[PDB]
Write a protein that binds this ligand. Structure first.
Ligand SMILES: CC(C)Oc1ccc(-c2nc3ccccc3c(=O)[nH]2)cc1
Ligand SMILES: [Zn+2]
Length: 209
């Protein structure tokens, strides 16, 4: 029951999502190995993901978390990159979309930095890059990221150089960077119902001039 609605580039909603995508690019400690070498994107399309059942699944869980946390869902908008983007938008997040080997355990991982999520669009470590050219830094092939509504609730703070259950008494984990002063936070949820894939963003990475 998913439909995708194209946003016009003239729409304020398109512009605000594009700005979050572009403004949260950073350099990565791998020199571009996983996600490619780029400072910005060419945004090709932004689509709203509409699914009544998945939205109601999300809001139901959000209310449960809010009620366990002094009426505070602690809702964020965060990026997610995955080879399973097309499954996620149709069936929702679940255990199959977890990063089993993630540093905060087997859960579903999200980033404040769009460029962090870009490292996972072709798999863990960028896999073998794009299917057409086998290039993790492909400037031709179209990539997709999700910009997701995520319920964190009470989040367990992990200081770090950067499914399972949430730590007891918590609804998520926050990976705070403790080495790279430019990195933004990363977050992990352990219930697929705590995220909704609100925007599907189609883009290319751009070769630096
Ligand atoms: C089958 C593999 C690719 O499952 C994964 C799917 C998504 C991710 C993923 N991990 C992240 C870790 C930190 C910050 C962001 C992400 C992310 O966007 N996706 C990891 C594994
Ligand atoms: Zn390619």
């Amino acid at each position: 029951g998913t439909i995708l609605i194209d946003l016009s580039p003239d729409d304020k909603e398109f512009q605000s999502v594009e700005e979050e995508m572009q403004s949260t690019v950073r350099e990565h400690r791998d020199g571009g190995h996983a996600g490619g070498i780029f400072n910005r994107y060419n945004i090709l399309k932004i689509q709203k993901v509409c699914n009544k059942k998945l939205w109601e699944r999300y809001t139901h869980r959000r209310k449960e978390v809010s009620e366990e946390n002094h009426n505070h869902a602690n809702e964020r908008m965060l990026f997610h990159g995955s080879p399973f983007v097309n499954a996620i938008i149709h069936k929702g997040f679940d255990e199959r979309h977890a990063y089993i080997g993630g540093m905060f355990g087997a859960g579903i991982y999200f980033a404040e930095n769009s460029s962090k999520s870009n490292q996972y669009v072709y798999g863990i470590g960028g896999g073998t890059g794009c299917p057409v050219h086998k290039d993790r830094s492909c400037y031709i092939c179209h990539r997709q990221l999700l910009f997701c509504r995520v319920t964190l609730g009470k989040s367990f703070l992990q200081f770090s150089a950067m499914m399972a259950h949430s730590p007891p008494g918590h609804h998520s984990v926050t990976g705070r960077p403790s080495v790279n002063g430019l990195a933004l936070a990363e977050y992990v949820i352990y219930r697929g119902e705590q995220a909704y894939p609100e925007y599907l963003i189609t883009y290319q990475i751009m070769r630096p001039e």
